[PDB]
Design an enzyme around this catalytic site. Structure first.
Site, PDB file in Angstrom:
ATOM      1  N   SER A  34       5.673   0.235  -3.679  1.00 55.36           N
ATOM      2  CA  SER A  34       5.666   1.224  -2.601  1.00 55.36           C
ATOM      3  C   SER A  34       7.105   2.062  -2.838  1.00 55.36           C
ATOM      4  O   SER A  34       7.366   2.330  -4.284  1.00 55.36           O
ATOM      5  CB  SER A  34       5.688   0.773  -1.317  1.00 55.36           C
ATOM      6  OG  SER A  34       6.044   1.744  -0.153  1.00 55.36           O
ATOM      7  N   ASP A  65      -6.632   3.040  -2.862  1.00 53.69           N
ATOM      8  CA  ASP A  65      -5.190   3.047  -2.089  1.00 53.69           C
ATOM      9  C   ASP A  65      -4.913   4.213  -1.510  1.00 53.69           C
ATOM     10  O   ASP A  65      -4.922   5.422  -2.040  1.00 53.69           O
ATOM     11  CB  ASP A  65      -4.118   2.875  -3.035  1.00 53.69           C
ATOM     12  CG  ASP A  65      -2.808   2.529  -2.606  1.00 53.69           C
ATOM     13  OD1 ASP A  65      -2.412   3.307  -1.600  1.00 53.69           O
ATOM     14  OD2 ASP A  65      -1.757   2.034  -3.332  1.00 53.69           O
ATOM     15  N   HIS A 116      -3.422  -0.951  -0.677  1.00 50.81           N
ATOM     16  CA  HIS A 116      -2.021  -0.654  -0.951  1.00 50.81           C
ATOM     17  C   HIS A 116      -1.224  -1.599  -0.939  1.00 50.81           C
ATOM     18  O   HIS A 116      -0.069  -1.577  -1.694  1.00 50.81           O
ATOM     19  CB  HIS A 116      -1.275   0.333  -0.085  1.00 50.81           C
ATOM     20  CG  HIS A 116      -0.103   1.093  -0.240  1.00 50.81           C
ATOM     21  ND1 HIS A 116       0.101   1.483  -1.434  1.00 50.81           N
ATOM     22  CD2 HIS A 116       1.065   0.893   0.227  1.00 50.81           C
ATOM     23  CE1 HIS A 116       1.649   1.985  -1.504  1.00 50.81           C
ATOM     24  NE2 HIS A 116       1.937   1.532  -0.271  1.00 50.81           N
TER      25      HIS A 116
END
Length: 265
Positions: free
Chosen positions: A94, A215, A244
């Site tokens: 991320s 995602d 994700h």
């Protein structure tokens, strides 16, 4: 030095091959707990919490300082220098995938390999670029995060996890609800104003981009974009799972890719 205490730095395992695990938005280093045992026999593993994690005293969060990702890169480099580590592999999820890209450009001597999970150089769409988000859409997200953070987080957690894995939704919720709401919004705003496309060619380290079946924040085309534009030897490793946060929802499958990617670097 004091940073090691503030950001809950932990060094586990042992070996000549050092690996740093850097978590993403809404989690802390505990998100690596299920993948960790697959790495500690063969690697010295460095874990730490981003300053925005709820497991860090939120009164350390200087909104002025952390107005951009370079400030987070500074923390990461200060940690590795304090630990006297001259060379490592870096696994980022991320926002930490973005931090890793920037860190590898600043210090190419230090980053021998990058593994990027849930990774994007830019989330907003552009004239000839699909990031996955429109301006008006993020405006509404920011409003919801401010108006009712709890309701926002409750809805986001299952969408982010993607796969119907109750334990993973609960675990992601635990840390998402632990984030101070103003910090959470600020981090999201910082991510959405970041555009790394111009600097991808400056990355020298080999890179593995981990792509799942879907995602909610990273279109499939983004993995291909990263493979085309990252400056190092880049491959895309596909995981046969949705979401994700594969380290939370599919740790065994992710661990396969990590063991192979971290074999030699």
């Amino acid at each position: 030095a004091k940073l090691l205490q503030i950001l809950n730095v932990r060094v586990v395992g042992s070996g000549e091959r050092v690996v740093v695990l850097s978590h993403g938005f809404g989690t802390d280093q505990s998100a690596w707990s299920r993948v960790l045992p697959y790495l500690t026999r063969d690697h010295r593993v460095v874990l730490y919490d981003l300053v925005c994690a709820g497991s860090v005293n939120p009164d350390h969060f200087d909104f002025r300082r952390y107005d951009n990702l370079d400030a987070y890169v500074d923390d990461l480099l200060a940690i590795l220098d304090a630990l006297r580590i001259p060379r490592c592999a870096f696994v980022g999820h991320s926002v930490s995938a973005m931090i890793g890209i920037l860190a590898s450009i600043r210090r190419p001597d230090l980053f021998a390999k990058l593994v990027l999970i849930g990774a994007s150089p830019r989330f907003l769409n552009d004239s000839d670029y699909h990031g996955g988000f429109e301006l008006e859409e993020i405006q509404q997200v920011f409003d919801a995060m401010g108006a009712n953070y709890s309701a926002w987080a409750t809805g986001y957690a299952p969408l982010a996890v993607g796969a119907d894995v109750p334990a993973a939704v609960q675990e992601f919720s635990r840390t998402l609800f632990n984030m101070r709401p103003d910090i959470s919004l600020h981090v999201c705003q910082t991510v959405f104003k970041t555009d790394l496309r111009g600097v991808l060619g400056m990355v020298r380290a080999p890179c593995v981009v981990v792509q799942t079946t879907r995602d909610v924040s990273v279109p499939a085309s983004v993995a291909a974009y990263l493979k085309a534009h990252l400056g190092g030897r880049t491959t895309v490793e596909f995981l046969q799972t949705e979401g994700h946060l594969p380290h939370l929802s599919a740790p065994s499958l992710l661990a396969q890719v990590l063991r192979r990617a971290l074999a030699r670097y």
